[PDB]
Amino acid sequence: RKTQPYDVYDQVEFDVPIGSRGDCYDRYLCRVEEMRQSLRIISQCLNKMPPGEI
C-alpha cells in the first residue's frame, strides 16, 4: 500500500508496524497495530468521501 499504491491509497496517511524478533509475539503486535492504523485510514476515508458516480 506504500510502495506500489493502488486506488486512493496515496491520499491517506498511516503507519506500517515493523517487528524486531521475527517471532509470534512481534507478528501479533504488528497485527494489532495494523488494526489501529486501519481505524485511522477508515476515519480519513469517511471524512474524504467525494460525490459522483460509482
Binding site: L39, S43, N47, M49, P51
Partner: protein, 71 residues
C-alpha cells in the same frame, strides 16, 4: 428538479476517532504491596502465637484431668 442527494459526510466533518493504545498504569508501588503483605503476616503471627499458647495451657489442663482420674 431537486438537488443531487447522496450519502455524504456532514458539513465540516466527523468528530475525531481514537485509534492509539490506551493501557493506563493504575497500580501501586512495589514497596506498598510488599509492606502490606509483611504487615499482614506479622499480624497473623502475633494472633497465632497468642492462640497457640492458650491452646497449650488448655491441653495441659485436660491432661491433668486425665492424671487425676487415672488411679
Amino acid at each position: 428538479a431537486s438537488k443531487v442527494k447522496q450519502d455524504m459526510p456532514p458539513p465540516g466533518g466527523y468528530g475525531p476517532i481514537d485509534y492509539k493504545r490506551n493501557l493506563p498504569r493504575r497500580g501501586l508501588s512495589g514497596y506498598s504491596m510488599f509492606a502490606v503483605g509483611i504487615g499482614t503476616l506479622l499480624f497473623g503471627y502475633w494472633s497465632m502465637m497468642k492462640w497457640n499458647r492458650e491452646r497449650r495451657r488448655l491441653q495441659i489442663e485436660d491432661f491433668e484431668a486425665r492424671i487425676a482420674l487415672m488411679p
